[PDB]
Design a protein around this ligand. Structure first.
Ligand SMILES: CC(=C/C=C/C(C)=C/C(=O)O)/C=C1\CCCc2ccccc21
Ligand SMILES: CC(=C/C=C/C(C)=C/C(=O)O)/C=C1\CCCc2ccccc21
Lengths: 214, 11, 214, 11
């Protein structure tokens, strides 16, 4: 109820028109501020208690950002396009020690998003589903978050089948990329925590705040 | 805690 | 094509009619042999090249087993029912140092499977979708595995909406537990690797084989 | 490698 895909699509269009690792961390920090402005544009999100808004974002930021630069890199050859306008080629990532995780992003996300031609509306809805993670610990009202999530995928499915009537399995195919997103998210965080530990690799304030406890 | 985040969400 | 939910349901019914950690590891080993017999009953699985059958099982065993004992524990109070006929109460797990992960299983899987009354057919189909993981590295023909996965959730969706016409979002709700399953799977493996490292906690041969490289 | 698994699948 009251979860039009048009509003979700608008949120996407509104926020987005030498060590590769350092470039990635700087881009993540920059995009974190934008993530907040994007979340605010997602229907009913801002109406949630401030505390729950913090929980949802702290719990989904990495997956939310990974989903965005991955879809943004669909046209890119063998690599990704950072929000800073910089390109990180698969070989550059490999020569920095993050080749394994980088390839997972290209194989499981980038490539797959390209094969099915995932559009911005679908992308936005998937990110909205991630944002509304009912499993996020601390939620003062998990049931409510679960309600918003069901409205998002209810609208997404309607979008599909209607825009792509010929593809009855598109809806499920879209949701079936969430497991990979969760796995890739978790691995990327592990790397970030190691970079922070080693001391090397410059980490900005907002990104550093996200690596805080819990 | 989460100083930056709270501030951005508040505005 | 040729992926009837009846066959999947039959696979489930055919394979299943003092340290809590040690009890869990022994149950996992026992269930690993059964997992193979179950996979063989899943349509088209045995027709895949032996090598790909190994890749798929090695990559999904933990999630496959977690999904099974979780659904099997829906009637259990605050805990789970092991295949060995033994019960592990939430307090017992907590007193063994695995309280955090144990609660995630109860909150994200057990409880949620109970709230929506997930049936055996639905459970089987979800496990069949996990088995057919097209992202499993090494697959000689990932496209084929992807095909089987699409037939499973195509049949599952048909099952739903027909058995539960009143619940149009049931299908998506079912698939939306896969992200949590992936996360819980990854954490459980991390624990297993630590138990193996510390030397304590008896680990049987088949379970030990699964903790091998890659 | 994966001795036990191959054997079980083979039968
Ligand atoms: C956590 C994370 C955030 C990325 C944010 C970006 C790059 C946003 C953007 O530019 O749009 C991703 C990481 C951070 C950890 C290292 C890494 C390696 C390969 C691919 C991704 C990553
Ligand atoms: C990897 C794994 C396998 C479990 C298999 C079982 C218990 C099968 C069964 O009895 O049906 C689960 C673990 C193994 C690691 C420790 C752990 C802690 C809490 C809950 C689960 C687990």
């Amino acid at each position: 109820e009251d979860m039009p895909v048009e509003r979700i699509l608008e949120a996407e269009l509104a926020v987005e028109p030498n060590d590769p690792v350092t470039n990635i961390c700087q881009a993540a920090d920059k995009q974190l501020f934008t993530l907040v402005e994007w979340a605010k544009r997602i229907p009913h999100f801002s109406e949630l208690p401030l505390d729950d808004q913090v929980i949802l974002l702290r719990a989904g930021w990495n997956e939310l950002l990974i989903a965005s630069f991955s879809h943004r890199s669909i046209a890119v050859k063998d690599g990704i396009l950072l929000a800073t306008g910089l390109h990180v080629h698969r070989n550059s990532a490999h020569s920095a020690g993050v080749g394994a995780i980088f390839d997972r992003v290209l194989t499981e996300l980038v490539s797959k998003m390209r094969d099915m031609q995932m559009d911005k509306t679908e992308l936005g809805c998937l990110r909205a589903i991630v944002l509304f993670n009912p499993d996020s610990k601390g939620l003062s009202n998990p049931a409510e978050v679960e309600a918003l999530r069901e409205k998002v995928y209810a609208s997404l499915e309607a979008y599909c089948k209607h825009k792509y009537p010929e593809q009855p399995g598109r809806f499920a195919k879209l949701l079936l990329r969430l497991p990979a997103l969760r796995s890739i998210g978790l691995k990327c965080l592990e790397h970030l925590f190691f970079f922070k530990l080693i001391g090397d690799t410059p980490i900005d304030t907002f990104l550093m705040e996200m690596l805080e406890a819990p | 805690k989460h100083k930056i985040l709270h501030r951005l969400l508040q505005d």
